[PDB]
Design a protein around this ligand. Sequence first.
Ligand SMILES: O=c1cc(CCl)[nH]c2nc(-c3ccccc3)nn12
Length: 135
Amino acid sequence: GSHMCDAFVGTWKLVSSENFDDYMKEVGVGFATRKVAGMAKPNMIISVNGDVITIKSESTFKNTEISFILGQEFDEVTADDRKVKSTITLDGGVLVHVQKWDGKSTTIKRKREDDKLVVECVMKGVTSTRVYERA
Ligand SMILES: O=c1cc(CCl)[nH]c2nc(-c3ccccc3)nn12
């Protein structure tokens, strides 16, 4: 077993969002993508197999999947079609995901809080909070 498995593994559904449109604006997502992505109610599937973590997002907008080893940079094509260099670490029980592209950076933190999995996305000074519960 691991901390990761106990905390995060499973299937999660989006229950609330705050400031997601504003976050996407800051990131540079265009109007039509923001509108359609903002309507999505994704299920997010986290699994662990050895050192490899997989995060899969299924929605009516886009289905995405990343697999990675903590601390090891990888190339990620985001749902909004940015080509980014990503590194994900586990810091004090929080999954911290940094994406770098075009001289820009954004950080996505995923943590447990009570029965929720809380996703905080930060771009410059703008934060969006997305709350998931077990499916
Ligand atoms: O709703 C979002 C938005 C972003 C980045 Cl824009 N990333 C993200 N990751 C997740 C998520 C939620 C639950 C489990 C795994 C991942 N939700 N989520």
